[PDB]
Amino acid sequence: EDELYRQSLEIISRYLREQATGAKDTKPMGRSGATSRKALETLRRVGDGVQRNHETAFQGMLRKLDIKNEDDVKSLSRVMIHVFSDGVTNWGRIVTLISFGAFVAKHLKTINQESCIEPLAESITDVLVRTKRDWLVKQRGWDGFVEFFHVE
């Protein structure tokens, strides 16, 4: 019914949850599982590097957002639209979107608000898919993501 949304949510939710808890989800992927698995391998390799390369800026933005509760987490959609959607789209910026999401997910675990991680992943997915579908489709979706970051 909306295959790109469903697959995006699975990849994003899995990465954020795994980043927060330190444990891999053992459940099978849904449809397009082969691609989703490679997308997840790519985020672990690339997204983890991004959180370190931008550590000071990431810690700074986190502090500025001052996330304490569910209402603070709900406020993030507006900021993501402002910063991510209102700019050039490329894979790098999409990785920063998702990687900073993981950064926030880990924060939510530290403040014992782990229940907000899946809603956060839904919000990120809404921003990504619902504001950049045209670009994502043209760039071959998650297959394109995997191809873009491929290690020979």
Nearer of residues 41 and 53 to ligand N0S, judged by Cβ: 53
Beta carbons of 43 and 100 less than 8 angstroms apart: no
116 is a site residue for ligand N0S (CB under 6 A): no
Torsion of CA 127, 83, 47, 139, to 10 degrees: 60
CA distances from 26 to 3, 37, 102, 103 (A): 22, 12, 19, 22
User: 36-55: which residues touch ligand N0S (CB under 6 A)?
Assistant: 54
Q: Which range touches ligand N0S (CB under 6 A), out of 33-41, 93-101, 131-139, 142-150? A: 93-101
Nearer of residues 32 and 96 to ligand N0S, judged by Cβ: 96
Q: How far apart are CA 97 and CA 105, in angstroms?
A: 12
Q: Which residues bind ligand N0S (CB under 6 A)?
A: 54, 57-58, 61, 76, 79-80, 83-84, 92-93, 96-97, 100-101, 104, 120, 124
